[PDB]
Write a protein that binds this ligand. Structure first.
Ligand SMILES: *[C@@H]1O[C@H](CO)[C@@H](O[C@@H]2O[C@H](CO)[C@@H](O)[C@H](O)[C@H]2NC(C)=O)[C@H](O)[C@H]1NC(C)=O
Ligand SMILES: *[C@H]1O[C@H](CO)[C@@H](O[C@@H]2O[C@H](CO)[C@@H](O)[C@H](O)[C@H]2NC(C)=O)[C@H](O)[C@H]1NC(C)=O
Ligand code: NAG
Ligand code: NAG
Ligand code: NAG
Ligand code: NAG
Ligand code: NAG
Lengths: 726, 344, 49, 49
């Protein structure tokens, strides 16, 4: 039969371009497709067309303008017109007047009187290419619900802008804010504190279990106070390790603090302080809650004490000896072995070597033992010729918290590997599952996934070879595409075949890969995938500087590498207030999680689905053989479902959805210059990378948090590192 | 709602009955919202029963009522939008959407449940909304209608009336002057016209067996279908002509004669559609400002008569005899306000 | 004792099906309505579960 | 109703929130009519008792 298949994310980011793909094959090549995205109420119509041939995949990037409403539904219809054939299919598409993803960045986190705040604002689109645009409003707000400053109706040209504002000599103190308001009515915020303070010149730091468990008699602890240029500081230390939530009333003057154990130390001249403590005073049990550790270094010749709050959430967990999954096929099939790789860990997060375990695959009757290796890994394999849905578990101990679980006053547990899997519907009895590299996915690199394709009978009549078609989906849309044909064995089942693909960039921190093979009889198979793409950007960027120097040693440099025609936002800051209080979510991870709709998975709410009509329900179910027996709905995975949790929707004629029957009809020498900032500027990257000359501030000694935020229309944005200049 | 409009268009109303009806309308509206589906669809029970799906004809009926109710009182567009996209979702590629039968009674609906008639009632309920013929859903609808019409026309039977009439009304709502012309011609062929009026009926003796009490499981639905026939006659793109108005007059005479002393008509559907039809008739014919009509009859044997018609005598039947054997009676009307002239 | 209960009634096709007993006439039933009884080895009674 | 007025007086409004609130108002009005008394008075339970 002649075959088509047209695919598109169920969502539509408007005012921009969005990609959608089409496949065609097997006769009457001279075909014309046309997508019509139409506003039902009142009327709008955006028309797109293409002419195509057989045995080709191709993707068109159609654009969408703004609308009246913020978010709407639209009837998307598609018409296929071959010289001797016609087909039409429609559905509902979610259109949305997307809000550009925007943000702020300050010079500093806190502020003192008499100074001037200085910040910058940025905006971008789905693609992180920069975007020039008029902003309605930004303003600075004073803690009393009152305002202190405001700017309105201003256009970004470099995709960013900078502002400043001076503070009085006696304003209000506390948590001031800055806020932006967009034309959509969307608002965003970036706080910052304002108050008097002193400039620190050291930082305490503890070492201790970030995670402490029940079966703990003692604890390593150590106190190391970094100084200017990370040098050792002498003086006194005192830690207060602490348990919380004792039997106190947390009221009537009753301190909720449980046992707080205090350890002193004379912080030596060289090196750092240590202490090994005993947890018997803590009673690591049911009704003594998490562990807070407050370490207070009093630096000598100043009397100056500073504290660090640490490891508050040391997970004193009931679940001990917790094993894990790593790479579990969510699914299995009636004609295949699936093999789950499964690591084992406990407690801290360290795998145990050489430890027997038991593995129960229920409704495969696969009760098999194994053991933990140096990496705690086991790659159990299970043949699958069995019933509908399978359950799997693994343990190191048995199905109960063996030592004293029934008291109501107990505190202990052990994890159990639990997992369930469903099979595909494949009426052909052929299918293509994939073996992925299902773990962390690096960037800027190629990777090969492998595929276990199998073909019941191969092509029944068809032709010689066959074709596979894969799509790599990103940021809820589309990014990459390709295909691969192969000569089939004459009537046989060929198992293995690989696919390599690049991981340059331009892809969400998730990468939703799928593939699907097509059969001229009107049949089809395929299977999805998921890769945790490491947070990584297209436009590479880097920084450097002419190295550290002495005190007034003015002449210094900074350098940056980026795309050959771009800009960069350069935040050198004296790292003392930042030592005092950190920055706020400034990273590629910031960019990534600021994104709207990380993953398109499943259609939205307002649209439910598209139904079909086939009801195979017999009068009596016609269950020949020994006996008769009634009807019921299944529960299993589907290609329609594969493309649903993929995130997108498509039109075709082939059997994609399972033939769900219809329900039952039955019813009833030096001069100080400004600290707390060194450099706060914009710069341009030529086609050779930039190098500016910074000017060594005097009378100040700490880290120098250099921050590079670059931007070009072609390569997008870039985030360079925390280069110091000690 | 349709009797509200009848009262307001004939002008026999008051703010008291108005306000009471308005309260009824809001109450029934909300009590109906208490039966719908989360997708926007509508069911008899619906809410408090998660495992369910709504019905199509019922969703369409509520849509039409929401339409005219918006026309009088306030109502939100989101509900009609959601039910509308739901109507779309059920549609097939070229075939029309199915019947997701989830009703309790066949009396409430006057049609035969056929996909043809069902889709006809649906698409016409759509077109009562101001809806472009260029819309996709309606485009496919008209495709269905044309196909079904040809099948029933070239065929010796497609029920001969009710199908054909509903098709006629929808084709009129389209813009297909020629198509509505041919179909109304065909319906006019199979006439149940009488001494001073016209109407239509089902076969009057079904070929297969029937029940006992009032033809149970068969409301016989003559008033509603005649009303839709009428409605089809009443709608042209600039304004209707004379001859459609004469046919409308005759069938309306039959209608008003077929009204029940209890009030309404033999059911709720036929009552609704009949009142809609009469409302549109009066909107065409019953002018509230045209109040100076003058009629002058003149016959070659110098037999001349004169009459006046104004608001005060709006309901007056001025009758006069006519003695001459060879009748060549020239009527001449002037001024404003329509007049019916029944001679025997 | 010939109980034929699968875990589930094992349909491959449109969906899976549940269990149910049957209702049809039988040779054992023929001989019961006859009024008599017998002993054999062959399958006379339907393979009830 | 009072927040409706506040929005419409300060002018920080829109027809969408307006329509949704209007629907809320009719709904609450009628659900309140479902608790009143035949004399016109009003009770917590009222009707059906
Ligand atoms: C009452 O029926 C009339 C019949 O024309 C409807 O039409 C309105 O008539 C009024 C008469 O004052 C006009 O002011 C309106 O412009 C007409 N169009 C409207 C309001 O729809 C009318 O709908 C009904 N209500 C009235 C009397 O306005
Ligand atoms: C809320 O805002 C307005 C603000 O004036 C309120 O006052 C009405 O304003 C309209 C403006 O045309 C006047 O015609 C009315 O006489 C005012 N009183 C009313 C309508 O009650 C009004 O209460 C609210 N709605 C608006 C904007 O009219
Ligand atoms: C809707 O229909 C009219 C018909 O002429 C067309 O001109 C118009 O561009 C369409 N869209 C809008 C917003 O009016
Ligand atoms: C495709 O082309 C062949 C040969 O011209 C023709 O027989 C067939 O009807 C066409 N349409 C199809 C397969 O739908
Ligand atoms: C940590 O605890 C271990 C014993 O569990 C001890 O041998 C070691 O000295 C402690 N300190 C460090 C840095 O490991
Ligand atoms: C688990 O099976 C293996 C054989 O495959 C066997 O060596 C082992 O003894 C079994 N487990 C235990 C606790 O014996
Ligand atoms: C998988 O196990 C089943 C058990 O019957 C067997 O039929 C099949 O040959 C096995 N396949 C292998 C080892 O590849």
């Amino acid at each position: 039969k002649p075959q088509y298949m047209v695919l598109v994310p169920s969502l539509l980011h408007t005012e921009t371009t969005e990609k959608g793909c089409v496949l065609l094959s097997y006769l009457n090549e001279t075909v014309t497709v046309s997508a019509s995205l139409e506003s039902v109420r009142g009327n709008r119509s955006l028309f797109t067309d293409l002419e195509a041939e057989n045995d080709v995949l191709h993707c068109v990037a159609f654009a969408v303008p703004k609308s009246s409403s913020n978010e709407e539904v639209m009837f998307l219809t598609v018409q296929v017109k071959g010289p001797t054939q016609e087909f039409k299919k429609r559905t509902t598409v979610m259109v949305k007047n997307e809000d550009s993803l925007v943000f702020v960045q300050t010079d500093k986190s806190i502020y003192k009187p008499g100074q001037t705040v200085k910040f910058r604002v940025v905006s971008m689109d789905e693609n992180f290419h920069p975007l020039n645009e008029l902003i309605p409003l930004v303003y600075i707000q004073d803690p009393k619900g009152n305002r202190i400053a405001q700017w309105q109706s201003f256009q970004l040209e470099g995709g960013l802008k900078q502002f400043s504002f001076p503070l009085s000599s006696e304003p209000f103190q506390g948590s001031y804010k800055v806020v932006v308001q967009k034309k959509s009515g969307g608002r965003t915020e970036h706080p910052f504190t304002v108050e008097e303070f002193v400039l620190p010149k050291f930082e305490v730091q503890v070492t201790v279990p970030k995670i402490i468990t029940i079966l703990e008699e003692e604890m390593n602890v150590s106190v190391c106070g970094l100084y200017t240029y990370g040098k050792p500081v002498p003086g006194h230390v005192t830690v207060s390790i602490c348990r919380k939530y004792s039997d106190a009333s947390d009221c009537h003057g009753e301190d909720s603090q449980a046992f707080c154990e205090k350890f002193s130390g004379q912080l030596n001249s060289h090196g750092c302080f240590y202490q090994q403590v005993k947890t018997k005073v803590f009673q690591l049990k049911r009704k003594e809650y998490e562990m807070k550790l407050h370490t207070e270094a009093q630096i000598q010749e100043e009397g100056t004490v500073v504290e660090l709050t640490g490891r508050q959430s040391s997970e004193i967990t009931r679940t001990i000896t917790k094993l894990s999954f790593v790479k579990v096929d969510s699914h299995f099939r009636q004609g295949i072995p699936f093999f789950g790789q499964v690591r084992l860990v406990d407690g801290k997060g360290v795998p145990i070597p050489n430890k027997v375990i038991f593995i129960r695959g229920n409704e495969a009757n696969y009760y098999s033992n194994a053991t933990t290796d140096e990496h705690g890994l086991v790659q159990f394999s299970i043949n699958t010729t069995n019933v509908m849905g399978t359950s799997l578990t693994v343990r190191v101990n048995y199905k109960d918290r063996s030592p004293c679980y029934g008291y109501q006053w107990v505190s202990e547990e052990h994890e159990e590997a639990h997992h369930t899997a469903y099979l595909v519907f494949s009426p052909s009895k052929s299918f293509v599952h994939l073996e992925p590299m299902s773990h962390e996915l690096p960037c800027g690199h190629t990777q090969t996934v492998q595929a276990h394709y199998i073909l019941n009978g191969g092509t029944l009549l068809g032709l010689k070879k066959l074709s596979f078609y894969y799509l790599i989906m990103a940021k809820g849309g589309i990014v990459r595409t390709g295909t691969h044909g192969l000569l089939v064995k004459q009537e046989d089942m060929k198992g293995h075949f690989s696919i390599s693909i690049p991981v340059k960039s331009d892809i969400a921190p998730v990468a939703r890969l799928l593939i699907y093979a097509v059969l001229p009889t009107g049949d089809v198979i395929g299977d999805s995938a998921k890769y945790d793409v490491e947070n990584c950007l297209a436009n590479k960027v880097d920084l450097s500087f002419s190295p550290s120097q002495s005190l007034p040693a003015s002449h210094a440099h900074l350098r940056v590498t980026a795309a050959p025609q771009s800009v960069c936002a350069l935040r050198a800051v004296d790292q003392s207030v930042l030592l005092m209080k950190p920055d706020a979510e400034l990273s590629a991870s910031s960019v990534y999680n600021l994104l709207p709709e990380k993953d398109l998975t499943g259609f939205p709410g307002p649209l439910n689905d598209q139904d079909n009509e086939d009801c195979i329900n017999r009068h009596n179910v016609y269950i020949n053989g020994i006996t008769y027996t009634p009807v019921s709905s299944t529960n299993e995975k589907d290609m329609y479902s594969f493309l649903e949790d993929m995130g997108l929707k498509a039109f075709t004629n082939s059997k994609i959805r399972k033939p769900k029957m219809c329900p039952q009809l039955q019813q009833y020498t030096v001069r100080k210059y400004f600290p707390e900032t060194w450099i706060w500027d914009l710069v341009v990257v030529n086609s050779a990378g930039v190098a500016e000359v910074g000017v060594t501030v005097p009378d100040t000694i700490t880290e120098w948090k250099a921050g590079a935020f670059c931007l070009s229309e072609d390569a997008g944005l870039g985030i360079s590192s925390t280069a110091s200049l000690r | 709602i349709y009797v509200l409009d009848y009262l307001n268009e004939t002008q026999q109303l008051t703010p008291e009955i108005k306000s009471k009806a308005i309260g009824y309308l809001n109450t029934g509206y909300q009590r109906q919202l208490n039966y719908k589906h989360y997708d926007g669809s509508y069911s008899t029970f619906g809410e408090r029963y998660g495992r369910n799906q709504g019905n199509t004809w019922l969703t369409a009926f509520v849509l039409k009522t929401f339409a005219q109710a918006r026309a009088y009182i306030f109502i939100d567009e989101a509900h009609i939008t959601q039910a509308l996209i739901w109507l779309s979702q059920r549609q097939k590629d070229n075939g029309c959407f199915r019947s997701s039968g989830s009703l309790l009674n066949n009396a409430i609906k006057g049609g035969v449940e056929d996909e043809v008639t069902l889709s006809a009632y649906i698409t016409i309920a759509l077109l009562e909304i101001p809806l472009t013929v260029t819309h996709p859903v309606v485009r496919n609808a008209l495709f269905c209608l044309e196909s079904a019409w040809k099948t029933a026309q070239e065929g010796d039977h497609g029920s001969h009336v009710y199908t054909k009439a509903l098709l006629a009304y929808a084709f009129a709502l389209a813009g297909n002057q020629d198509k509505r012309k041919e179909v109304l011609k065909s319906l006019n062929e199979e006439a149940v016209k009488k001494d001073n009026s016209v109407h239509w009926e089902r076969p009057q003796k079904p070929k297969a067996p029937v029940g006992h009490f009032y033809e149970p499981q068969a409301p016989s639905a003559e008033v509603e279908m005649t009303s839709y026939v009428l409605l089809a006659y009443l709608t042209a793109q600039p304004a209707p002509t004379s001859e459609d108005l004469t046919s409308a007059t005759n069938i309306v005479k039959w209608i008003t004669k077929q009204q029940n002393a209890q009030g309404g008509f033999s059911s709720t559907q036929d009552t609704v559609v009949a009142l809609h039809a009469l409302s549109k008739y009066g909107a065409a014919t019953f002018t509230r400002t045209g109040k100076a009509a003058q009629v002058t009859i003149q016959s070659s044997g110098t037999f001349s008569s004169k009459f006046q018609v104004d608001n005060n005598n709006r309901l007056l039947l001025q009758q006069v005899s006519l003695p001459e054997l060879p009748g060549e009676y020239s009527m001449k009307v002037t001024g404003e306000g329509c007049v019916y002239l029944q001679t025997s």
